[PDB]
Every structure is written in structure tokens, then in C-alpha cells.
Design a protein around this ligand. Sequence first.
Ligand SMILES: Nc1ncnc2c1ncn2[C@@H]1O[C@H](COP(=O)(O)OP(=O)(O)OP(O)(O)=S)[C@@H](O)[C@H]1O
Length: 287
Amino acid sequence: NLYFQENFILYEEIGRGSKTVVYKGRRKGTINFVAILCTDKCKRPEITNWVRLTREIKHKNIVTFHEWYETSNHLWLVVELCTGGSLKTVIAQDENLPEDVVREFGIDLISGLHHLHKLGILFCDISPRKILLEGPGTLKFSNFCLAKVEGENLEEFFALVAAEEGDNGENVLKKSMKSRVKGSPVYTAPEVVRGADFSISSDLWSLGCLLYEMFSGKPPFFSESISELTEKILCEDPLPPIPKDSSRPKASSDFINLLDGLLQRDPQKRLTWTRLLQHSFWKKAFA
Ligand SMILES: Nc1ncnc2c1ncn2[C@@H]1O[C@H](COP(=O)(O)OP(=O)(O)OP(O)(O)=S)[C@@H](O)[C@H]1O
């Protein structure tokens, strides 16, 4: 059956996104609770992309796609429910995440990201707000609006979705397609900042930013100024990662070495997957 309200029950709102209200929901006649992203139709290109990239994926560290509905006034994206909060929230609430938690989180993210790359999918906007905790643990990549297939022109994809429909209503704002595929500058690899396409290697850079931030409480390159932020990313070695509270344990030499391989400005010098998986920080987790 094709009618959203005949298939799902809505409970409380649990979050907000761009042009999006997120609810806890349940498929009728089941005990399967889900997250329901209630979305303005203008977000159809982003939601189409998310579905087409993930619809056949089942992986512990990737939010599972279930259903996609359209009613008179909204799109409804039905995905796996994550109750543990975002990784951004965790980093903001838990001061000085211990290195062993950073390793476990790192193993979650590597396992999800390696799977995505093996499928030919780049996440492109790895960032703490786009990773959610399933419950007490398990990190999941949770937003695929800006993801794409390696080498794909996502701007052109979005324009094609828009063209075939035909969502704007009476809205007059003309938002460039380049604007819609734009991600978080804080986690953008330097070669992408200088104009190169996203790659497996630039995702690995962003992964290195995340691990750095998990341990130290702050991303390695940060400024409220977009031009200051770009100069930092392009020209400044990151400071050694220290816990915000200096009384807590320092980073191991293995952790430091891993971050040095991931935060290489030159992508040809950055760690590749095989070397990354074999790194001693993981303590043979990927043997
Ligand atoms: N699977 C899910 N389970 C539970 N809550 C979710 C789920 N997906 C999204 N949410 C909630 O909705 C919020 C949306 O966050 P984001 O993924 O950052 O979306 P957004 O703000 O629309 O991002 P962009 O950059 O604009 S596409 C999350 O922080 C959660 O509060």
C-alpha cells in the first residue's frame, strides 16, 4: 500500500534537520520502531540520492534504509532508529573521551566507511553531526544527502532529479547546485579545498579530523572565519592532540602516528586503506 499514514504511526518528534522534522515512528502491526524524516519536497534531490546510494545496504555501522513515501505536502524517509545521540553531542557532553573509546569508535567508523568505499560510495561530508549512536554504542553513518559514487558529478545528479519532477512550490530562492552539494569546511581535505574532487583519500582525511576531535575535544583546524579556516587547512600543521582537561592521559605514540598518516596535506602521502587497517593503533582488530 502506498499511503504513508496507513503504514506508519508517528510518536514524538526526536530531531530537526534542514527542511526536516524527525519523528520516532513504528510500522503498523509491528514492534519495529523507526526514525521518520519528514521532509519538504524541495529536498527531493537530496533524499533521492540517499535512497539510491543505501537502499540495498545492510551494515552495522550504516543507518539502514527501510521505506520512502510521498504524500500531498511532504516526503517521508523511513530509516533505522538511533537513540544514542549524535557524535557531535557525545563530544560536546563527554569531556576527554579516553583513547580506548576513540579506538572503538574508530573501529565502528572504519568498518562502515570501508564498506561504503568497497561499494564505490564516498561519504564526502564525514562530520560528527552525520554520525549517530544506535543505543549505548555502535556508531552509524546517518546522513547520505551529500554522498556519491566515486567520480560522480553530484551537482548534475541533483539537477537531473529536479528536472524530472518539474517541489519548489511558490518559493523564489534560487540556490545554486554547487551550494547544495557543499559540506562542512572544517573537515574538508586540502586537495578538495583547492578544487579537486572528493576521493577515498579525502574521506580518510576527514576520518582523521574526527579521531583527532574525539580525543582532543576540538577539530584540528577551526575558525569561525572561512578564509582563516582555509589557510589553516592548507598551511598549518595541527597541534599535538591534547585532552581539553590536561590532567587526563596523553595520546599514545600509536595514536599520534595514525593521526600523522591521516592528516597528511598531500593525498599521495596520506595513509591508504591497507596501511590504515594494519596500523598498530587498532591492535590487530582488522587482522
Ligand atoms: N536514523 C535516525 N535516528 C534518529 N534520529 C535521527 C536519525 N536521522 C536523523 N535523526 C535526527 O535528525 C537530525 C538530523 O541531523 P543531520 O543528519 O545533521 O541533518 P541535517 O541538519 O538536515 O543535515 P544537512 O547538512 O542539512 S543534509 C539528527 O541529529 C537527529 O536528531
